[PDB]
Amino acid sequence: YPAYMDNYLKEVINQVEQETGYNLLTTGMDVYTNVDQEAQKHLWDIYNSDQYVSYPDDDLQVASTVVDVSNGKVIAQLGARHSFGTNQAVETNRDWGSAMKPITDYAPAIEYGVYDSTATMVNDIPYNYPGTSTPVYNWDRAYFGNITLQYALQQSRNVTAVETLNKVGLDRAKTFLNGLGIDYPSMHYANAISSNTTESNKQYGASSEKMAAAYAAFANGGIYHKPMYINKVVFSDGSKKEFSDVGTRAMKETTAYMMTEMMKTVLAYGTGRGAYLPWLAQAGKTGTSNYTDYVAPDEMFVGYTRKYSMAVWTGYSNRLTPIVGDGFLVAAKVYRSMITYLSEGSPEDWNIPEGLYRNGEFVFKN
């Protein structure tokens, strides 16, 4: 089999075992998967040439997953650049940091009534984590004072994010995240902007796989579908069985739409400008993790259209090896290239759902 299929095959083997109980390596059986071969080869070319994106060096790693938002099907996944070894695309050992803000803080805040419009005012000013004198600093180290919720997301304020989680509460945030396939042994306010505050087993935290599936719920109206690498298995006895995810409601369509409208500005005028495409209706969010006690261990980007969701992680094998300079550009560029490939031959815009009304650049609940 081709090298570019190694990561996908590994996950196919795992899901076949989960769904049927058999190991396709020891038990003969035919399996039909959801990988888009051309898309997969394209992702490999994005990773391993200078055609689409320029890298600072050949050591910087990239790991991404592309999901079909309508059914959770994984169409492409590549865990590294330059048999069935560790697949970073599904590993939850790295911190997706600020990329956690939309699904951890804002989505549940809107879903549960903390905010009723994208114009609601919030206050970006010096703030400490609840119960401490430990300051929450914004990525740019500044404060913009009284601003709209939409601008808060546009410029990725950490202050506003942490106070939002405080309002949502650790219980509800946990439940909301669980509905999006993400979990932690225990929730803390630090999780408002981090997925790896402490070492945890594989089932907890974020990975490109989980993040792609999570953001797909935004794209499709609020429905969560588990990552699906297989659609059919034909066992040696002749029987043929199909596999598809029924889906569950993770958030109201009104919540999904509002979140989408704000993440559109992240790209058009905000921190996600590096992924902006004027001809495509898409929304996204940049992500950055931080060291303890400009450099960072991880730089992420997650974006989606009404058809696909793609989560991207970048960083070095040893987190202590920092991303620096133009290295921070890669995540958004990998996404930009892939989504172009996936959309240029396409790609409708979202339609404001029942229960919401528009007033200029903002959206409000009735």
Binding site: L9, L24, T33, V35
Partner: peptide, 15 residues
Amino acid sequence: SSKIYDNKNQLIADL
């Protein structure tokens, strides 16, 4: 022998 196919049902691997 386990044959794997892509989303267009074309063979991509034999494991």
